[PDB]
C-alpha cells in the first residue's frame, strides 16, 4: 500500500472525526489506519497549539491526512 | 541532401565508428610426447647453461609429483627445455584431503593385509640398477609394458558406494563440476 509509504516522515495534518487537527510527523501506519505520529501538535478551534508528543491515533477517528511540510533533517 | 549521398554518407560513417570505436581499438601451445622423447634421445651453449641452473626445481617437482601406490601410471604436464636440458613436472600434487587420507588408510589396510599374507617379503635390492648401467629409455622397454596391478583396496559396492567410481583415480573428481 505504497500510497502512504510515500508519506512517511512528512509533517502531515490529520483532521479527525470530532474536528480536531493533528499536525505530526507521520511515522507509521497499519491496515486499520492507526497512525503513529511523533512531535504531534493538536490544532483546535479559537486557535491554540497543544503539543502532545508521540500520538498513536486509532484509525476509527481519522478522517483525512494531508501534508503540511517536508521531512526534517 | 540527396538520398544516395545520405546512404553512402551513412556507410562511410558506419565503417568509421565500427572501426574507430571497435573493441580491439579500446584504450600456450602443447607438444606431443614424441617431440621431447626425440630431443632427450638425440641429446649456443648459453641456452643449455641458463637452463641447467634450475635442476633442483626439476628434482623437487619430480619427487613431489610421485605416483601414489594406488596409481600405476601418472601422466603429468611437463615443461621441458627445447635443448632437453631440464624437464619440469609442471603440476602441483593437489589432492582432496579426505580422499587422500582415505586412500592412504586403504593403503594401510591393504599393505598390512599383504605383509600378513606375504610371509617372506622380498624387498627391492638397492640400488635397483647398478652403477655403470645406463638409465632405461622409456620408449624401448617401459612405454608399452603394462604395470602390475596397483594397491587399490577392494571396495564393496554396498557400503562404499558413493566413493568407488572415483576412489583410486589420480585427481579423483577433477572433471566433475
Amino acid at each position: 500500500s505504497s500510497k502512504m509509504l510515500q508519506h512517511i516522515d512528512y509533517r502531515m495534518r490529520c483532521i479527525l472525526q470530532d474536528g480536531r487537527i493533528f499536525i505530526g510527523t507521520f511515522k507509521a501506519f497499519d491496515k486499520h489506519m492507526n497512525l503513529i505520529l511523533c512531535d504531534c501538535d493538536e490544532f483546535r478551534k479559537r486557535e491554540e497549539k497543544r503539543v502532545l508528543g508521540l500520538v498513536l491515533l486509532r484509525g476509527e477517528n481519522l478522517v483525512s491526512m494531508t501534508v503540511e511540510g517536508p521531512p526534517p533533517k | 541532401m540527396s538520398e544516395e549521398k545520405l546512404q553512402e554518407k551513412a556507410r562511410k560513417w558506419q565503417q568509421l565508428q565500427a572501426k574507430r570505436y571497435a573493441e580491439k581499438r579500446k584504450f600456450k601451445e602443447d607438444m606431443p610426447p614424441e617431440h621431447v622423447r626425440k630431443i632427450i634421445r638425440d641429446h649456443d651453449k648459453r641456452v643449455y647453461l641458463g637452463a641447467l641452473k634450475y635442476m633442483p626445481h626439476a628434482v623437487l617437482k619430480l619427487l613431489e609429483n610421485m605416483p601414489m601406490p594406488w596409481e600405476q601410471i601418472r601422466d603429468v604436464p611437463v615443461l621441458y627445455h627445447i635443448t632437453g636440458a631440464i624437464s619440469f613436472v609442471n603440476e602441483i600434487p593437489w589432492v582432496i584431503e579426505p580422499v587422500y587420507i582415505s586412500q592412504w588408510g586403504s593403503m594401510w589396510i591393504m599393505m598390512r593385509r599383504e605383509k600378513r599374507d606375504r610371509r617372506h617379503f622380498k624387498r627391492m635390492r638397492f640400488p635397483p640398477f647398478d652403477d655403470e648401467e645406463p638409465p632405461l629409455d622409456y620408449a624401448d622397454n617401459i612405454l608399452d609394458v603394462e604395470p602390475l596391478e596397483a594397491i587399490q583396496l577392494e571396495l564393496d559396492p554396498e557400503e562404499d558406494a558413493p566413493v568407488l567410481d572415483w576412489f583410486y583415480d589420480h585427481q579423483p573428481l577433477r572433471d566433475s563440476r
Partner: protein, 48 residues
C-alpha cells in the same frame, strides 16, 4: 613455535615464466618418463 607467517609477495611463478619463453615447451608425459628424463638430465649436468 619458530613459525613466522608467510611474507607478502607479488606472486611470481617460475614455470609460468618458463612457459612464457621460447626455450620451454609444454607436453604431457608419464611420470616415470620424466623420472628417467630428470635422472638423465641431472647426470648430464653433473658430467658437464
Amino acid at each position: 613455535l619458530k613459525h613466522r607467517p608467510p611474507k607478502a609477495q607479488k606472486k611470481r611463478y617460475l614455470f609460468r615464466s618458463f612457459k612464457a619463453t621460447k626455450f620451454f615447451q609444454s607436453t604431457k608425459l608419464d611420470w616415470v618418463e620424466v623420472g628417467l628424463q630428470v635422472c638423465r638430465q641431472g647426470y648430464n649436468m653433473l658430467n658437464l
